[PDB]
Design a protein around this nucleic acid. Structure first.
Length: 491
DNA sequence: TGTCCCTTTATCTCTCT
DNA sequence: AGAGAGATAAAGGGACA
């Protein structure tokens, strides 16, 4: 017999029960826990289903799933029910922060280390609990936390970094490795290659930060005379997420892409300067001619699609969908390029294909409006949120579809929409803002925290803002959102 | 195998002017 | 408004007990 048969039946038996009270988990939630936390995590969730759901902890189903769905998920579940009350009552963390720390591989370790080191990091090293939480909230959080305790002094004193920079480097998966590498390579990269400490911190502050720094050290000379790449270009490739893989792939593919396709080094660097830049470049090499053939898309448009995180996904999705979206849905190919040219272009493209008919027929939007909503980062999220909230926003709150479309049509559109839905009543009824004013605040990137800052100032007034009328606060919030409001308090 | 840690890739949100 | 940046998540490998 296949040995895993017994364990699979075990998994499936306990699985079916969890669909019952008090968690009621779907198949996706169940598969998720099984694939990352394994059967032990599934058995643990069931075993501790009642201890977590309500009294005392009051963890949602979602939160239980978030904790359970990682390597050692069973350990994190045991640790949370034990340490959540300690970290909340004795260190003043919110349950949300405890759950965030918990929801990574080795969550147990992170939680116990936060419990152990938060006092010394805050008192003796001058960090805030929020900074400690951020450091802890990644795989290997325990290692990062111990490494920050160990290295914060030498990094600030011997190497001139600020505590904020140290915290930023630590606040990535593998943070311990990046910190140790920065300690070693900061003088080398700064003195031999003329990089600013800020540039070094930028390269280091990514997952795989150790690899990106070591690859910059190794490849900077070669890249900056053989290829006539500037240091600024190499730093950009190394600091934007693509890191080590992106840098090595730029070395390989720059001449190929320029010579075979007529791209500039700037176009190649742009493609490279994203998460998964390696994947994007290789896909461009493959797919550009296929996309530009038969007088199809231009190289320029192919570059734009490629030049975002998930570029590879965007490119292949366009390849699969350009025909059906243009022909069956009636989009210009220029409209398809527009939707594709953002982080998560693939998600947005697939969501437009799925939801354009529904948004048009059931909600009365134009395809232009669907395209506009789709054409931002997280376009998929904004499109699904418009589908869900258009009727309550229009019918119960009185907004026009035009206003809903405007709110949705920025990065974070989903967040802006949910926050208007949530806060419009108290803003208008309780505080005398007009709906137009609420829509105006919400119709920018950062619409949600801009709205929340306004509500905070109207419900728990900070005297530092008291000289501003509601109208002036509205103008400020529209101009620069939460940050402008915060900046104004500081003076 | 279960748990911990690290790296890559992809997606989403907000800030900075 | 479009670059820059942080946050978050999925998924695979190394390491070890």
């Amino acid at each position: 017999q296949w040995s895993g048969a017994r364990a699979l039946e075990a998994l499936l038996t306990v699985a079916g029960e969890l669909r019952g009270p008090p968690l009621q988990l779907d198949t996706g939630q169940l598969l998720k826990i099984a694939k990352r936390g394994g059967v032990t995590a599934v058995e643990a969730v069931h075993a501790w289903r009642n201890a977590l759901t309500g009294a005392p902890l009051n963890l949602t189903p979602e939160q239980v799933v978030a904790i359970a769905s990682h390597d050692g998920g069973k350990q994190a579940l045991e640790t949370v029910q034990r340490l959540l009350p300690v970290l909340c009552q004795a260190h003043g963390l919110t349950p949300q922060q405890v759950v965030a720390i918990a929801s990574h591989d080795g969550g147990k370790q992170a939680l116990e280390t936060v419990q152990r080191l938060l006092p010394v990091l805050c008192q003796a090293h001058g960090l805030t609990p929020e900074q400690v939480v951020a450091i802890a909230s990644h795989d290997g959080g325990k290692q990062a936390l111990e490494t920050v305790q160990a290295l914060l002094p030498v990094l600030c004193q011997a190497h001139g970094l600020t505590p904020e920079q140290v915290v930023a480097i630590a606040s990535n998966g593998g943070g311990k490795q990046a910190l140790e590498t920065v300690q070693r390579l900061l003088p080398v990269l700064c003195q031999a290659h003329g990089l600013t400490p800020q540039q070094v911190v930028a390269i280091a502050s990514n997952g795989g930060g150790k690899q990106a720094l070591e690859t910059v050290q190794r490849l900077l000379p070669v890249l900056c005379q053989a290829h006539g790449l500037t240091p600024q270009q190499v730093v950009a490739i190394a600091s934007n997420g693509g890191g080590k893989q992106a840098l090595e792939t730029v070395q390989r593919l720059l001449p190929v892409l320029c010579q075979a396709h007529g791209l500039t080094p700037q176009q190649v660097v742009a493609i490279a300067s994203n998460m998964g830049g390696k994947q994007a470049l290789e896909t461009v090499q493959r797919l550009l001619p296929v996309l530009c053939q038969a007088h199809g898309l231009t190289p320029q448009q192919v570059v734009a699609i490629a030049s975002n995180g998930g570029g590879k996904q965007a490119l292949e999705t366009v390849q699969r969908l350009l025909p059906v979206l243009c022909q069956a849905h009636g989009l210009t190919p220029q409209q398809v390029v527009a939707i594709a040219s953002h982080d998560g272009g693939k998600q947005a493209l697939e969501t437009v294909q799925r939801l354009l008919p529904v948004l048009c027929q059931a909600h009365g939007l134009t395809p232009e409006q669907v395209v506009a909503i789709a054409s931002n980062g997280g376009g998929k999220q904004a499109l699904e949120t418009v589908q869900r909230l258009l009727p309550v926003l229009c019918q119960a709150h009185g907004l026009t579809p035009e206003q809903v479309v405007a709110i949705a049509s920025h990065d974070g559109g989903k967040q802006a929409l949910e926050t208007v839905q949530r806060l419009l009543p108290v803003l208008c009824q309780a505080h005398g803002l007009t709906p137009q004013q609420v829509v105006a605040i919400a119709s920018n990137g950062g619409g949600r925290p801009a709205l929340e800052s306004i509500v905070a100032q109207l419900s728990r007034p900070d005297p530092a803002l008291a000289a501003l009328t509601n109208d002036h606060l509205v103008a400020l919030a529209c101009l620069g959102g939460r940050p402008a409001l915060d900046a104004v308090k500081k003076l």
